[PDB]
Every structure is written in C-alpha cells, then in structure tokens.
C-alpha cells in the first residue's frame, strides 16, 4: 500500500511558523522525488517545493525561497517542510505529492492536504441572527426562512434546524471571510405557508472548535 | 681530530 | 524558459451525461511532450489523469485521453459520466517552476430554471448590537450570471456587497445565491429604501424586490 | 511520434533520427535508422557519407600527467547516403518511409546494425581538476557532404549527433546472493562463521538493498565491530586490463558479537549520487551532454564469456566485513578481518519512453 | 667547539623551520593518501611507496634532530644519555635514513615498472607484493643498521671521566671495524641508492621523451634532488672516518663544524622537500593535499 500521510498543519500567526510532516508510505525517498503543492481556498494548484534525495536537490518557488526549506529524514521516510515568515498569502491546503526518480516527473500520488491558516485573529464564537420571513414581499407560494451566523473566526460551523428534523431544501452557503478576519455564513431553508404559524423553525449552532452553542427560533411577523 | 664522529 | 504559463481555454464548461468534451491548454512556449493531467473533486486531492500528453495513467478509464498538436495540448472526455464532475488541471514538468494551469470545471447542464428572489430584513437584535445586514437569496438558478444591485435610496450600491454561491444541487443540479449587504451603526436609519435587482439572463425580464423600514 | 532533427551550421545538411537512446537486448541492439536531407544543388558533384563511432577515452595508469587519455575508436561505420551508388534495397523503416514522405525527394535513408558486445554509455565521473571531454564510452552519429572519405571534414558542412547505447533489468529474477566464511583462527577450534546473503538478485536505482547477516563467532575472539559496503568496479580493457573499485554506500555497525555467541541482523543500504559526487573515476551513465545521469547500470555481458573487447564493465558487489580484536602480543589495534563478498545487478526496468523527463531549471 | 653566536642561532632556526614544514608536509601527504574518495586500479601501488617514504622522513624529522640539536648543535661537551640512549639514538637515526633512501629507489624501480615495462609491474607488482616488500625494506632498515648498536657508546675522550668537560657519543670500537661500518653505510645509502634512482629516472625520462605540470622536467629534478643534499652529508661520515690523524687545525675544527651544520641541513631540507614535489608533480593530488593543510538538437513530427 502507498500513501502519503500530512501533519503539523493549523492556525499560525503571520510571521509565525511550521513544519509540515509527510509521513511518505510504500515507498523510498531515493527513488522517488517528494513534492509540496498548495492550493489557495477557490484558487487553482501551485507547487511549492520539491527534493531529490537521490542527486542531493531542493527546489523552491520564486515566492516561497528564502522562507521555505525543505529536508527529507531517510530512515523514517519522511519529508519535512519547514515555513517561516508566514505572510496572509500563505494561506492555502498543501499537498505532500511523490514522483519517480527516474524517468517519470508527474506527480501521481497525492496525500489528504493539511489546511494552514495564517492569520492574526483569534478564535471567537458567532451570534444567530434570524432572517425574518417577509410574508409580503415574498410572491412564491413556499416562503424562505432563515439565520444568519456572523463573526466566528475557527473552521465552519454546523447548523442544522430542528436537530434534522426539518429537510425541505436546506441551503447552507460555504462560509466567507470578511475584511475584519472572521468567517461568516447563512442558511436558509424553503417551507411550505401551510404550516407557517405552526410548524416550529429552531436553528441549531454547534462550534465545538470555539466551543460556543447559540440557537435562535424564526417566526414569521 | 675532534670530530667525535659528527 | 524563465517561467512559462499554461492558459487553459475553457474555465467553465457545461454538458450533460454521455457528452463529448475536450479540455485544451496551450503553453507560453515548448514544453516538448512534458505535460501531465489531473481531476480533483471538490474536497479531494489531485488524481493524476495521463501524462507525457498522450500517455493514460494505469487505473485511469480509457474515456479521458490526451493529444499534443503544438505548443497546445487537448484533454477529451467521450462519453462522459456522472461522475466526470470534477475541476481539469494541466501540468507541464519540463522545467523546474512545474507550472499548472488555471482549472477547467466540468459541471453538469440541464434545463434553465427561473430564479426566485427573497428579502430578508435585518434581525432586532442585530441593530441593537451596532451592525445591520440585509440579504438577498437567489434560488435555483441553472446558469450563474446574476448579478445582484441594491438601490440603496436610489443610490447604485457596490463594493461592500460580500456574495457566496453554493455548489450544484445534488439532487437539482441547480444553484443558489446569497449576497450580503454589511450596513454601520448609522447607515441603515439614515437610508430607508431598500431593493434587491437581480439581473438573471435566464429569465426574460430583471426583477427587483424591494424593502422599507416598517414592513414586516 | 517525436523525430530529433539538427541541422549543418551553414544549414545545407540536416539529419534526422527517431531515437536519441538505443536499446541493447544482448542478442541484438537496435538498429540506429534515419533521414538525411540534403541540398543536391549545392552539393556540386559531391557525396554525403554517414558515420557511427563507438569512442573510448581513458588514460593508461591515470597520474599526474594523462599521456593515453587522448582518445580510441572501439567501432567505426560508414554510409554514402546522397548517392544510391550501391544501390541498397535493405527494408526502409516505417519511421523513414514517414520522414522521407514528409521531407521529400531529397530526403535519403541511412541505418546502421551496431554490432554486440560493444560498451554500452558509460560516463567516468570528472575530477575537480580535470578539464576536457569526460572519460568513458560515448556514440555519435556524424553527416558530412564530402567528395571522398579521406577529405578533410570541414566544420561547417557536419552534423554530430550523440546516442546512447543502454540495457534494462532482465525480466527474469536470478538466484538470490548467498556467500558465507568458515575462518579457523590461530590456536583455536570451532571456528568463526559468516552467513551474510542478500534478498534480491537484481535492483532498481534508488532501492534499498537489505544485507541479511547472521555471525556466530564459536571461538574465544571477539568481533570488535561490523562493516557492511557496496562497492562498484569497473573493468577498463583500453591499454591493460586494469579493474578499478569505489564503494558507494557504507554501514558501518557497532554491533559486537562474544564468544561462544550467535548473532543475527538485518542491514539496509542505498546507493545514490549525492554523497559520491566527488569520487573521482566513478562510473556514472551515459550523458547527453552534460546533465545528471545515476550511478551507472550494470554491465549484462552476452552469453556470459563472448569476447572481451575494450570498453568499461561495470558490476556492484555488497561486502560483509568482521573485524576480530587481538591484543596479547599486540597492542588491542591488530584486527583480524573475515570478509564476504555478494554480487548483485543495478540496472533500471525495462521503460514505456524515453527516460528523459526530468525537469531542468 | 668555538663557533660564532649569531651562526648557532641561525642555523638553530632554520632547523626549527624544517622541522615545522617537513613534519606539516609529511603529515599531510599522510592524511591526504589514506581518504580514497577516487576509484583505485587493482594493481596500483604508487601511494604505497609515497605513504612509506613520507612516513620515514616524518620518524627522521621527529627522531634525529631533536637529539641533533642538544647533544651536537647547541652544546657538544655533555649529553643528553649514556650509553643505551645515546647507541639507540644512533641507531635510530640510521635506520631511518636507510629506510628513506630504501623507499626512494623503490620508488624509482615502482615507477620504472610502471612507464617502461607495464606488463612485468601488472603480472607480478602487486598490492599484496609491495606491501610484504615495503615491510621486508623497513624491517632490513633497521638490520643494516645493526653495527650502529655495538658501534656507539659512551666515552670520556679525556684524561679522567670525574670532569664534565667531556661525554658524548663516540664509537668505541676499533678503527678497522668504524672504517668498515662506515664503507658500508656509504655504499648502502649513497652510491647504490642514488645510482639506481639516477639511472631509472634518466632512462624513463628518455622514454618519456619519445612522445615529446612539468612532466618529463621532474625527473630532472628528483634526481639532483638526492644528489644536492645526500652527498654533503655522506661525505662528511667519510672525512672524519678514514682520515688520518694529521693536518689538525683550529681553523679545519670550524670548518668541519661549518660543513657538518650545512650538511645536516641539507639533509633535513632533503627530508622535507618531497611533500613540496609531491604538491607539485600532480593535479589531484595538490586540490586534497591543499585543500586541509592550507545548431541545437531540434524536435519534430514526420
Ligand atoms: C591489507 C592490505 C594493505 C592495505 O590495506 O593498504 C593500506 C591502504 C590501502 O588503501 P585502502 O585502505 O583503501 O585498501 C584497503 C585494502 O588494501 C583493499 O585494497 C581494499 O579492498 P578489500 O576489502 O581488501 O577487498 C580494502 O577495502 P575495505 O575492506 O576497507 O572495504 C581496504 O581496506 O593504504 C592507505 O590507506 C594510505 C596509507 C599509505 C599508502
Ligand atoms: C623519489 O621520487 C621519485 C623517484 C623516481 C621517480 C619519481 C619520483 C616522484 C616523482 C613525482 N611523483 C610521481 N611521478 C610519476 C612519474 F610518472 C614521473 C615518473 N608518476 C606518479 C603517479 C602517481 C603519483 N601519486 C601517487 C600522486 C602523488 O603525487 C605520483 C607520481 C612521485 C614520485
């Protein structure tokens, strides 16, 4: 079995650091070539670094060179990647890659990617803020209800409503980042009018990461 | 003679 | 070469199961026959596809192929499933700044769906807090596009406007929207006119839908 | 697909070839096929010859002064391409046939049969001081409009294209190295034992090479320490049969064993060039020009004992050494050294392409 | 022993400074010849001989002068043994010298069989061979030196030994047996050695001339190398053995003083200019030794 397996990834400051660790499986370090490609969040691939092992070879990007450095630990089949002077435009999922050494430069096995975040904000817990149902300015026949979570800075969050029981379209949009450094997200959901007044519409938060519970209750007005 | 045989 | 750019031609592409489509890039210069492609899902890692232009990686399905002209080189899918779904990306290894290219996404086309416009007055307890945001959702629309214009009194907002856009409906193959309008403590008593124009290609005519301070 | 074409420097002569690397199957090697494309209208009543040489550059006894190191010519071949004079009707390859429709009327045929037993491209790795063409074995094919082949081969009207001549791992495993040593020491019975074997007949480059060693010392001497290496030698028939050696990788182990005592241990070594890229004379492969090639594959001799003509004969071989402390008469330093010696293949697989893909900065 | 102060001094340092360049050089060449980071033929045992004779000329560097230096330079009135250090000394100091010129000619022959006749060095000059030969030449150094035992001593060479105005060396033995020793030791390490190496040298130096660093212009060198300074100093072994008692003069005291003190430093600076050759001659060697002790190819498509 081959697998390449990341670690040492999380939330840093910017000019903290890192050393990310792929612990490479099922094969050696000297015939093959090990390869660090990151992906911005919505952006495309870009590689990073790259060493031989064999003819004695580290390689960088124009963007990463002074800071980056990169080493492989033959005995334990490892290749490090240390960061420093981590900047906001180092925020990406990088990816540990392997090719063959010999006559093969293509990057056919990938590992998982561990998602670093470089930023100065902390974590913090976000506030439920229910979207009213305007049942006039709405034409459908299904009105749409809604909360809105704002200002959390940790990975996404979990909403659900009514602990699962309501699935009837539920659109839960990826989380933005806003200017002042904290995500924030919305999830809104289509209901039939028949059960307006009645049906109850409780939204669930979890932020286990930030460790915060807020739930807020929408009715229509 | 005293060299002392160098 | 000091650095060379792989330009993919179709960023977007949409088709339907059983199509045929073909993925081409063209490079800055002669990268020879160095050219590697890969399928990532979203939320996975790159697969490698085939490499050296033309050669099918072992395991790959032999509906993805790959062919070099020039300096451009072409990824088809004939007949393409479901699960071709995926973003495109083009590598060449010919020098050591490996360069890929900008990602070709591959959704699945169906039938134009009218989009559904919705108004969302900010919470009371928001205002409370200092902050106001209103919010405008946009449901099921199939062919992106739709760009969202406020009014605030008359006035062409722009630039504050945050708006994110759900992926393809698992079971609808269709799209949502939701753009968010970050107001001051001060902003949203000052202004009381509200709106919401939506200037959707699928459908015939824009719609706007508007608000006021007020109404429920 | 892909054709390799360079032109004459005044550009009145181009040839063209499929391959840049041909590969050696022992019985029989590839055979080196092309186009010429020639001017007749400036040709002037004047012959294009094609020529495949097989050249060998060493010194006799390197020192500080390389009297030999000058050059040798392990085969020569010759073609008149222009002028079908002779008339050869030998088959066309279909890769000729497709440059000849491509090129025209003007594109005429020349194939060589490279002849076995003859050195596959092997670069001798340069000293820091040593300045000029690298030593080992190179191919060229050379094109040149001339009206005779005695004339002096001008410099604008040539074409000098290097090949390569290489070998693949066989695809049928061999025995499994075994070696062993029974060494009775001086004044004592039950003799020391050794038992060092490999796992593998043949290896890929870049693997590692698992050395299974198990001693078992039944006399009164201690094994003071364990030296395990991987050394490459290099058989040189230029002047004088000279066989060279250089280890490559090196395991030293601490690993004592007592009288009276067994011990069994499994070691892993890897030979790579980046802890070898100053030894001087190290058998590296074929190049091109000037790129990194690895350490240089193991030399499949035909039917085993054919014909040993000049070129270099390069073989890897795995030595178990235990070194055995004597004090007494001594002073604790006079080590007794048993040694094994286990003979392997370094070759690369057998490819689907051209090996060269890797990328250059 | 009357000699000038300031001469004494000089000279004092200039064998100081031998001693530091020879002993620096000779320690070099010894590190630089035992890292083997070069592919080395199966039968090339050139740096054998280089490892031998560097080696003998660092013992000679360490072993001779600084006895040299106390016993016959500074004072020559006291000494610094009796009879078991001062014959040991002796012997030590002989043997080494025997084992340097040993190593040179073997040198010489290595080489001559090398460049002139490969096939008898290829067939029988292996590393085995030489190193057994190496060993029977330091091991019969020391045998040629055997009569330097019984030969030395301790005397007084005055009227009574209750004075310190004399004890040093001084062979005891007769003069016939002192006349004999020293035939010998003359033969052995100046006629024979120094012939060999002149006539080996010469001959490859012709044959190297056949093809027309220096190169051939070494062995020029080599040769009158051995000659400048072996010569001077074995000579003086022979003007204060086989001369008579005769011709005695203050003057002829200093001079032989003079020429003992200009021999001996020819014979260190002898002893420490082969590191220099050695730096010289090659290429490969020097960057070691130096370096710790200082149209395109186009593509297409048919
Ligand atoms: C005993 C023979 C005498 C002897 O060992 O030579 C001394 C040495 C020769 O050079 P070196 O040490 O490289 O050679 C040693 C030995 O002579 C064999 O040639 C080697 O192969 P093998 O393993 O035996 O097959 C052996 O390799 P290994 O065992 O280390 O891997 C070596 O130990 O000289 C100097 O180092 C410079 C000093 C002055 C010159
Ligand atoms: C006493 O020194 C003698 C006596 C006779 C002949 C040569 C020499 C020295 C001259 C310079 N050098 C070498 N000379 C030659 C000659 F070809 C010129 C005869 N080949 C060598 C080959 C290898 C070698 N090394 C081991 C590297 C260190 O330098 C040294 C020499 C050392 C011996």
Same mark, same amino acid.
């Given at each position: ?7 040492g ?16 499986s ?6 093959? $070539? ?40 033959? $005995?334990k ?14 925020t990406?999922?990088?990816?540990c ?20 975040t ?17 049942? *006039? ?6 009105a ?10 940790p ?15 539920? %659109? ?13 997200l ?6 039939? $009018? ?12 979890? %932020?286990?990461?930030?460790?915060? *519970?807020?739930?807020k209750?929408v009715?229509? *007005? | ?5 160098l | 070469?000091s650095?060379?750019?792989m ?25 020879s ?11 996975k ?6 490499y ?20 451009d080189?072409?990824?088809?899918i ?71 214009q ?10 504050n406007?945050?708006?994110?856009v ?15 309008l ?14 919401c ?20 | ?11 009145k ?52 002064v ?32 497709r ?17 076995? @037993? ?36 001008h ?17 049928? !495993? ?42 078992? @010392?039944?006399?009164?001497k ?17 002047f ?8 490559v ?12 005592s ?12 980046? @802890?070898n890229?100053?030894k ?37 071989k ?32 057998? !490819? ?10 | ?22 002993t ?41 002068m600084?006895?040299?230096?106390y ?11 009796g009879?078991?250090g ?31 006749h ?8 292996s ?8 060993? &029977? ?5 020391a ?10 001593g301790?005397?007084?060479?005055s009227?009574?030994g ?24 003359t033969?052995? =390490? ?18 190297l ?5 220096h ?22 072994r ?5 001369? =008579? ?9 200093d ?13 260190y ?13 090659? &290429? ?19």
């Amino acid at each position: 079995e081959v697998q390449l397996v990341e670690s040492g990834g999380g939330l840093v400051q910017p000019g903290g650091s890192l050393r990310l660790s792929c612990a490479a499986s099922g094969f050696n370090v000297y015939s093959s $070539s090990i390869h660090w490609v990151r992906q911005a969040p919505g952006k495309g691939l870009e590689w990073v670094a790259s060493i031989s092992s064999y003819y004695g070879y580290t390689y960088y990007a124009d963007s990463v060179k002074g800071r980056f450095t990169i080493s492989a630990d033959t $005995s334990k089949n490892t290749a490090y990647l240390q960061m420093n002077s981590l900047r906001a435009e180092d925020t990406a999922v990088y990816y540990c890659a392997r090719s063959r050494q010999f006559w093969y430069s293509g990057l056919d096995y990938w590992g998982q990617g561990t998602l670093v975040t470089v930023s100065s904000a902390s974590t913090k817990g976000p506030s439920v803020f229910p979207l009213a149902p305007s049942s *006039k300015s709405t034409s459908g026949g299904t009105a749409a209800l809604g909360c809105l979570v704002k200002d959390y800075f940790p990975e996404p969050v979990t909403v659900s409503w009514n602990s699962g029981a309501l699935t009837s379209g539920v %659109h839960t949009f990826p989380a933005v980042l806003q200017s002042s450094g904290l995500y924030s997200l919305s999830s809104v959901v289509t209901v039939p $009018s028949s059960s307006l007044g009645t049906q109850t519409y409780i939204c669930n938060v979890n %932020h286990k990461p930030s460790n915060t *519970k807020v739930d807020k209750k929408v009715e229509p *007005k | 003679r005293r060299p002392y045989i160098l | 070469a000091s650095d060379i750019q792989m330009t993919q031609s179709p960023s977007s592409l949409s088709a339907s199961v059983g199509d045929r489509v073909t993925i081409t890039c063209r490079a800055s210069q002669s990268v020879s026959s160095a050219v590697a492609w890969y399928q990532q899902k979203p939320g996975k890692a790159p697969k490698l596809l085939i490499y050296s232009a033309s050669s099918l990686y072992s395991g790959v399905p032999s509906r993805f192929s790959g062919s070099r002209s020039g300096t451009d080189f072409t990824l088809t899918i004939s007949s393409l499933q479901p699960e071709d779904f995926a973003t495109y990306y083009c590598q060449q290894y010919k020098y050591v700044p490996v360069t890929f290219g900008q990602g070709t996404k591959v959704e699945i086309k169906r039938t134009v769906a009218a989009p559904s416009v919705f108004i969302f007055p900010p919470s009371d307890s928001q205002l409370k807090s200092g902050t106001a945001s209103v919010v405008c959702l946009l449901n099921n629309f199939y062919p992106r596009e739709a760009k969202v214009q406020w009014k605030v009194d008359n006035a062409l907002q722009s630039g504050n406007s945050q708006e994110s856009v759900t992926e393809q409906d698992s079971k609808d193959s269709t799209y949502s929207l939701s753009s968010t309008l970050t107001l001051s403590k001060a902003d949203y008593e000052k202004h009381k006119v509200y709106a919401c124009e939506v200037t959707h290609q699928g459908l015939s005519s824009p719609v706007t839908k508007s608000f006021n301070r007020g109404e429920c | 697909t892909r054709v390799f074409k360079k032109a004459s420097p005044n550009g009145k002569l181009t040839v063209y070839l499929g391959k840049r690397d041909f590969v050696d199957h022992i019985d029989l090697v590839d055979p080196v096929d092309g186009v010429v494309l020639v001017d007749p209208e400036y040709l002037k009543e004047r012959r294009v010859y094609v020529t495949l040489t097989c050249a060998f550059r060493y010194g006799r006894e390197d020192l500080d002064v390389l009297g030999l190191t000058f050059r040798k010519d392990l085969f020569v071949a010759n073609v008149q391409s222009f002028p079908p004079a002779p008339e050869d009707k030998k088959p066309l390859t279909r890769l000729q046939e497709r440059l000849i429709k491509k090129l025209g009327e003007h594109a005429y045929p020349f194939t060589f049969e490279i002849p076995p @037993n003859l050195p596959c491209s092997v670069t001798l790795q340069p000293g820091p001081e040593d300045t000029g063409k690298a030593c080992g074995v190179d191919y060229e094919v050379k094109a040149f409009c001339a009206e005779n082949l005695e004339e002096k081969i001008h410099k604008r009207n040539s074409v000098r294209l290097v090949i390569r001549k290489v070998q693949y791992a066989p695809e049928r !495993p061999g025995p499994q190295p075994t070696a062993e040593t029974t060494r009775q020491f001086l004044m004592s019975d039950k003799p020391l034992h050794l038992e060092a074997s490999l796992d593998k007949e043949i290896y890929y480059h870049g693997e590692p090479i698992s050395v299974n060693v198990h001693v078992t @010392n039944n006399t009164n001497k201690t094994v003071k320490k364990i030296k395990i290496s991987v050394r490459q030698y290099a058989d040189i028939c230029l002047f004088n049969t000279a066989q060279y050696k250089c280890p490559v990788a090196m395991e030293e182990a601490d690993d004592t064993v007592a009288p009276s005592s067994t011990f069994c241990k499994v070691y892993t070594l890897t030979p790579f060039l980046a @802890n070898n890229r100053e030894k001087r004379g190290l058998a590296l492969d074929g190049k091109l020009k000037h790129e990194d090639t690895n350490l240089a594959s193991s030399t499949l001799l035909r039917e085993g004992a054919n014909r040993e003509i000049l070129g270099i004969i390069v073989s890897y071989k795995v030595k178990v050494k235990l070194v055995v402390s004597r004090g007494g008469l001594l002073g604790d330093l006079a080590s007794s050294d048993v040694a094994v010696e286990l003979p392997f293949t370094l070759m690369h697989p057998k !490819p689907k392409e051209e090996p060269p893909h890797r990328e250059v900065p | 022993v009357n000699t000038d102060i300031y001469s004494k001094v000089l000279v004092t340092a200039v064998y100081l400074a031998l001693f530091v360049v020879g002993t620096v050089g000779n320690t070099v060449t010894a590190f630089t010849l035992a890292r083997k980071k070069s592919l080395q033929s199966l039968q090339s045992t050139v740096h054998y001989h280089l490892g031998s004779l560097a080696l003998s000329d660092l013992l000679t560097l360490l072993l001779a002068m600084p006895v040299e230096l106390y016993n016959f330079i500074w004072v020559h009135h006291p000494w610094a043994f009796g009879d078991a250090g001062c014959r040991g000394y002796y012997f030590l100091r002989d043997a080494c010298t025997y084992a340097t010129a040993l190593n040179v000619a073997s040198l010489s022959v290595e080489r001559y069989l090398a460049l002139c006749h490969p096939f008898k060095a290829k067939t029988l000059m292996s590393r085995s061979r030489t190193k057994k030969f190496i060993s &029977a030449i330091w091991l019969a150094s020391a045998l040629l030196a055997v009569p330097m035992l019984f030969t030395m001593g301790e005397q007084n060479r005055s009227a009574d030994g209750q004075h310190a105005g004399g004890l040093v060396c001084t062979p005891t033995i007769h003069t016939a047996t002192v006349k004999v020793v020293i035939q010998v030791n003359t033969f052995m =390490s100046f006629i024979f050695p120094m012939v060999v190496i002149s006539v080996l040298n010469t001959i490859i130096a012709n044959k190297l001339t056949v093809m027309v660093r220096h190169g051939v212009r070494v062995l020029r060198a080599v040769v009158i190398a051995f000659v400048v300074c072996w010569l001077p100093y074995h000579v003086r072994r022979l003007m204060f053995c086989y001369i =008579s008692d005769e011709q005695w003069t203050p003057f002829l005291y200093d001079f032989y003083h003079y020429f003992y003190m200009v021999t001996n430093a020819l014979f260190y600076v002898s002893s420490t200019i082969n590191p220099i050759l050695y730096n010289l001659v090659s &290429a490969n060697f020097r960057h070691i030794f130096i370096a710790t002790l200082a149209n395109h190819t186009l593509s297409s498509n048919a």
